[PDB]
Design a protein around this nucleic acid. Structure first.
Lengths: 50, 69, 90, 244, 21, 106
RNA sequence: GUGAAUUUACUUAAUCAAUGAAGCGGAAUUUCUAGCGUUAAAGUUUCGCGAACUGAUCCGCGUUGA
RNA sequence: CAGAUCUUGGUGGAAGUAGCAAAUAUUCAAAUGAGAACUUUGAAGACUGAAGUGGGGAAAGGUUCCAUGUGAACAGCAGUUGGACAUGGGUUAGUCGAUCCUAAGAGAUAGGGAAGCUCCGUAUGAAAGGCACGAUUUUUCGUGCCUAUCGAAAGGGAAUCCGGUUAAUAUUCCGGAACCAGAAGGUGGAAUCAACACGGCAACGUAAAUGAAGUUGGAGACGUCGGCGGGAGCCCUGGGAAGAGUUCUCUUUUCUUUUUAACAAACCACACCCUGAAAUCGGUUUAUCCGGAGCUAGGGUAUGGUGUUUGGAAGAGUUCAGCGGCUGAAUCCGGUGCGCUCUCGACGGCCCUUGAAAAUCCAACGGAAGUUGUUUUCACAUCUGGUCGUACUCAUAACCGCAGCAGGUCUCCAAGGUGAACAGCCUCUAGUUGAUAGAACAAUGUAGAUAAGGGAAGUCGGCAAAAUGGAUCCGUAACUUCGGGAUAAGGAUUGGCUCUAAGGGUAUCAACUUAGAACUGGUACGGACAAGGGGAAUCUGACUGUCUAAUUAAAACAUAGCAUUGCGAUGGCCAGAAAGUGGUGUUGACGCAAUGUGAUU
């Protein structure tokens, strides 16, 4: 809700930052085996459960 | 806001250092409102007489900032 | 006179039985009737709760400990007489 | 095979509802002034105690030792009015509402809120319309024989105190309730003891009386006193049974 | 419940104290 | 025009009291208002006291002393009739105990 | 457990009741009323709200009661 | 390895099949584009119809908000569009909450249990902490006086309003105007050498008007129902003025706009006072209360805004006419009420029910201290106000049901007509036009209608359907616990229009509400909507009420009543491994505990 605790907003802020696509220059590195973010989340599909 | 019914009270409050600015408001009924912005209140004097209006306006201290409608 | 027998217990309709409504009728009449104030003489004593009888008379405003449905009970009156008798012989 | 309703009444939801209570109705603590003389108090207000059939009386006394007022919560006797003076002590008069030792009152005195033992501030004859009768005295043993509202005879110390008069609010049980709703409201301020399901209407896992194709007990409903907590149902240790 | 309207009260007033006087 | 609560408190409660106003912009709006003040009760008879306004408890602290009191003994604590009964009862009982002292000293 | 002649008694061990653990045991020797009662003072003896001593007895001291 | 309804993964026939059918509904033009039933704009047609498909919040979600961009994938058709994908941006508080307080309740400490994990216990078997006086007292201190914490974004509570502003934030920013608390001294005034003010018969008033310890009082602080009266907004309404719709004809009209916040000042009558003494008793409410405990009457005091007048404040906002940001105008004067929502006042009813606490705040009693100096809850200026929450959804797509699921999920605002009505039906503001479409009308079906004559012959059973239905008037049985039954049953009446007849306020105004009288119409008439079928009886449970969520709503359970039993506290009943353990019990036989019957007769 609008009424949040500071602890909740911190966890939500980190969840937002982790819910981003991968930088493109990561994909060009030597020995790179990472192509797409395998930990992506959508707000309807998976819930954060905090 | 405060209403002042006495002209010399308006001058005295204008003389007081808390006075910051003054507004002269000319209404459609030929009644003027002399408003004085102080630290705490907007002091307003309703002068319905024309001749008392401009003698008061020239009575206001020169250092005070007087502003048109 | 609108009702012949039920009186105040006409508010209960046809329910709970005639005898139970009859016993309630005696007690409810006692419970709600106005009583003369023993302190100011006005007819101003009414029941606030079971055992508490308060007078609304101006200047008196006395509150009474009494019976559930009537201001004074027979047991209290009888024993008040005996206690008065006992104190006098002592 | 299940803990029965009687066993579960050890607290929790079966506790007393105590938010609206107006204080514990008690006599004055037995002090020097009330042991040797009398102390006078003023009845401030007669109040309704939720869950109690009798009214309470707020009585203000003076602290004999400090500049302060001590207000005591009494069980009101019939005839107590606001502004009345109530005297408590050995040398108190024999008037309705006064608190005197039972040894100082003549045989046949009607008393209420009587102390079982000297100093416990009132145990007997506390319910509405109930009272205790001073049967007699035994000065050599310092005891007083009294008649309790159940008709039993009891011996109390002559220094035990009792309020002269009958507890106010008498006749409260005469009126039929006419209603589950009014029984609901009466017990809503006392505890969770209502409504009551019969044991015969239960299942065998729930009660000794439960089970069977017809609603019956199957065994005698008069039970011993040595029986187990799950067994103490029906008529416990009944000497006589049935309506005379 | 007497005096069903203002006029009826008036006529009662007119007849009253006139039969007396 | 319909209105909304100005706060995030739904559920009209004894603290969520609102009032309808017309704003100078021709808008129907709520103004949230506080519970009404209370005239102090008398200490003996319990009736409201005469000569004192009806404010909230913290709101009384902004009045001067004379506005919260009546210029009489127990003014702002007891009503006039309560004070008069105090005065007469005090004097009469003092007279009684003087007479009893005279009677019992001999 | 302690005594006194199965019979009586005592309380310090334990048990129960009350409280703010206030007046317990000895001796000396406040009731016509819904009011207020505090922050000693007169008395005596030293030297002003400075003292003291009583006002307000002493003794035992087991907080009282069962 | 061919098997184990074997394991894991993969893939077939069914099969381009079942299906994509609830929530009335879309259509034309244009734009964009490779592509338009679906995107956007305009036009039209509709719906939600204020208990909304509207405007907000709480719980929950967490970035879904906003702008820009778009190959897929996702939106069970489509897609140029999207809560989807990508990139950035976005939430501003002394006053709104949290924080503070306490509630039920949690939970340390003292202690006591327990092999222990840990349990119990919450002012208890605790040495559980303070405050004040003094030439400094044997320069080694004397003399007095008296309870954690956590727990409420719906409870209690210090103080903010209007207009404007962004793509997205506003009681937070901007402009203007206030307010609260705290702190220090300053200025002006007030008291005081008759130390701590005066006036009023009084209720009490005044800009001030010292008051320690201690004690006490008040506020905070309180149910539910019913009408009555006041205010505000809304609704309604008579004129004026601005535009706009309509104009074959009619309509001095149809519609829109006519606005005024917190805050500041002044003003404003059930309780109380004064004189006076009342029966030929009077006063008086819708509601019968009041008076020798002082009525009526007369004169006073208090309470005092969501009232009036002004400041704020017309400069704002709104509406219109021009000009190339600016200039002109208008923004007016009234009515009304069994109306609606909220609120306030004074009352009435109800209870074997009597309907929180605490933090905070104020007052009194008391009388310590005390020419300058003392005081000063008085008017003024002066300074300050941290931390966290703040976007958005709150639902036929942002929550929970595996989902963009016909389910569920607390609450605030609430226009007009019809009508008793927040009914149904229709409309205004706002919102939406979303739910694969197109063409065809075969059988069967789902959902609605109707049917000659008969009228339950159907069927285990009138199951389903029909019939009845509003209001007014007349009439109403057995039986009964005398209250009911009862809308019993049975009859009649109902439109439109022109009229009168009454019912109120100060000659004149305001207001729907009933009685008739004609006249009139495909004997129509609650004309749509809405809206009981009834009667005679048996069995049974007295009644209202409760249960097998998801096959049983019942005669089952509960109930009031009746009865029995145990228990006078060292006690009954129940609980704990134990305990210096708890419940009943803030209890005391008109009580509690344990049962059995089940209103009355």
């Amino acid at each position: 809700p609008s009424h949040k605790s500071f602890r909740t907003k911190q966890k939500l802020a980190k969840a937002a930052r982790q819910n981003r696509p991968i930088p493109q220059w990561i994909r060009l590195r030597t020995g790179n085996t990472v192509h797409y973010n395998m930990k992506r989340r959508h707000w309807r599909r998976t819930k954060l459960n905090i | 806001p405060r209403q002042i019914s006495d002209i010399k009270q308006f001058l005295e409050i204008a003389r007081r250092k808390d006075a910051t600015s003054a507004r002269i408001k000319k209404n459609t009924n030929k009644d003027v409102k002399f408003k004085l912005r102080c630290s705490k209140y907007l002091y307003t004097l309703v002068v319905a007489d024309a001749k008392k209006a401009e003698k008061l306006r020239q009575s206001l201290p020169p250092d005070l900032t007087v502003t048109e409608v | 006179k609108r009702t012949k027998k039920v009186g105040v217990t006409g508010k209960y309709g046809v329910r709970y039985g005639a005898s139970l409504r009859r016993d309630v009728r005696k007690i409810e009449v006692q419970q709600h009737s106005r009583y003369q104030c023993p302190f100011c003489g006005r007819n101003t004593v009414k029941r606030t709760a079971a055992g508490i009888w308060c007078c609304n008379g101006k200047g008196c405003k006395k509150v009474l400990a009494g019976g559930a449905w009537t201001v004074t009970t027979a047991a209290a009156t009888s024993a008040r007489s005996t206690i008065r008798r006992l104190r006098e012989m002592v | 095979g299940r803990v029965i309703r009687a066993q579960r009444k050890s607290g929790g939801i079966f506790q007393a509802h105590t938010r609206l209570r107006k204080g514990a109705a008690q006599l004055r603590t037995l002090d020097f002034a009330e042991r040797h003389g009398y102390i006078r108090g003023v009845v401030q207000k007669i109040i309704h105690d939720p869950g109690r059939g009798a009214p309470l009386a707020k009585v203000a006394f003076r602290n004999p030792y400090h500049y302060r007022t001590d207000v005591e919560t009494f069980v009101a006797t019939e005839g107590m009015y606001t502004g009345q003076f109530v005297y408590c002590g050995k040398n108190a008069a024999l008037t309705v509402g006064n608190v005197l030792p039972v040894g100082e009152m003549p045989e046949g005195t009607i008393i209420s809120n009587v102390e079982e033992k000297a100093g416990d501030r009132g145990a007997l004859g506390r319910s509405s319309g109930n009272y205790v009768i001073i049967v007699g005295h035994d000065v050599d043993t310092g005891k007083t024989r009294v008649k309790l509202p159940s008709g039993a005879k009891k011996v109390v110390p002559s220094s035990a105190r009792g309020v002269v008069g009958i507890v106010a609010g008498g006749g409260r049980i005469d009126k039929p309730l006419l209603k589950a709703g009014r029984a609901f409201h009466k017990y809503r301020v006392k505890r969770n003891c209502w409504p009551r399901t019969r044991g015969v209407a239960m299942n065998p896992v729930d009660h000794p009386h439960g089970g069977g194709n017809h609603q019956h007990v199957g065994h005698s409903t008069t039970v011993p006193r040595q029986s187990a907590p799950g067994q103490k149902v029906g008529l416990i240790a009944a000497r006589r049974t049935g309506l005379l | 419940n007497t005096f069903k309207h203002k006029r009826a009260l008036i006529e009662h007033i007119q007849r009253a104290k006139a039969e007396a006087n | 025009q319909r209105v909304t609560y100005r706060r995030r408190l739904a559920y009209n409660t004894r603290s969520n009291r609102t009032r309808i106003i017309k704003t100078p912009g021709n808008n129907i709006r709520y103004l949230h208002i506080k519970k009404l003040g209370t005239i102090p009760r008398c200490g003996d008879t319990g009736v409201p006291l005469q000569g004192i306004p009806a404010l909230r408890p913290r709101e009384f602290a902004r009045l001067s002393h004379n506005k919260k009191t009546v210029q009489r003994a127990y003014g702002g604590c007891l009503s006039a009739n309560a004070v008069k009964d105090r005065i007469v009862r005090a004097f009469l009982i003092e007279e009684q105990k003087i007479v009893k002292q005279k009677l019992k000293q001999l």
